[PDB]
Design a binder for this molecule. Structure first.
Ligand code: 4D6
Ligand code: CL
Length: 262
């Protein structure tokens, strides 16, 4: 408890940056919190809320996920690993959700944002869930600038852990939609060096990463440990220098520290 706090503080100092952690353990309703009420730039971890907003919308529009969306050269941004393969064709909203969540595709994220009515609509959805901390201000790519002191496109680790718990394990979404979100997150391709890297190989993880300005390196996860109740873990990290390098190792270390001895 105090041991874990000290270990997180030592990791943070060694890292040179600012670390935010929230773990919810659904075994006993306990938490581990470190700067859990401070704001951090979400960066690509915000893609979970945008996909969830589309899933919510689909509850009253049962054919929504099949809807076709044109991909054009004008849609391309800075990071288009899936979308660049589909220029001059269409992708379904399901495909765009999967591309955003599993490959962190920024065009896909922009199409999800646009569909549901823009960043203020994704934010209003967060409010409807009871999350009064989340704010999505901008589209891709600018939502990742992560300037220190800038509250745009931020949330707290506590808020995001509670919200992710509600989305993946609770009743924010209908059963089909929740299952789809969990399926997409379990199939993520981008997370193996982050939270997953600090957990035993046998544990099952659905996570969403993000990388941004000021070396901002983030991951949010739902975790099914071997023969245990699930966990929700948010690890946010950001650094003082604009061109700081990614530090996914810091997220792995934080994950190890807060799950040790479970
Ligand atoms: B996102 O924050 O994270 C992605 C990688 C990941 O999931 O680990 C890549 C796309 C996103 N980040 C960016 O677009 C990078 C920046 C844009 C403006 C400043 S940094
Ligand atoms: Cl192992």
């Amino acid at each position: 408890t105090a041991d874990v706090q000290q270990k997180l503080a030592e990791l943070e100092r060694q890292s040179g940056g600012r670390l935010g952690v929230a773990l919810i353990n659904t075994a006993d309703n306990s938490q581990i919190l470190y700067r859990a009420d401070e704001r951090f730039a979400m960066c690509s971890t915000s893609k979970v809320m945008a996909a969830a907003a589309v899933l919510k919308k689909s509850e009253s529009e049962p054919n929504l996920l099949n809807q076709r969306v044109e991909i054009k050269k004008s849609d391309l941004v800075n990071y288009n690993p899936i979308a660049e393969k589909h220029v001059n064709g269409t992708m379904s909203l399901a495909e765009l959700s999967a591309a955003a969540l599993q490959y962190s595709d920024n065009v896909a994220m922009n199409k999800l944002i646009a569909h549901v009515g823009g960043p203020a609509s994704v934010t209003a959805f967060a409010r409807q869930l009871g999350d009064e901390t989340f704010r999505l201000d901008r589209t891709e790519p600018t939502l990742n600038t992560a300037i220190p002191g800038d509250p745009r496109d931020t949330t707290s680790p506590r808020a995001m852990a509670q919200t992710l718990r509600n989305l993946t394990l609770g009743k924010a979404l209908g059963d089909s939609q929740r299952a789809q979100l969990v399926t997409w997150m379990k199939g993520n391709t981008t997370g193996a060096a982050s939270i997953q890297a600090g957990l035993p190989a046998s544990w099952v993880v659905g996570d969403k990463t993000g990388s941004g300005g000021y070396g901002t390196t983030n991951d949010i996860a739902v975790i099914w440990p071997k023969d245990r109740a699930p966990l929700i873990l948010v690890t946010y990290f950001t650094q003082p220098q604009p061109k700081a390098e990614s530090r996914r190792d810091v997220l792995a270390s934080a994950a190890k520290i807060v799950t040790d001895g479970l």
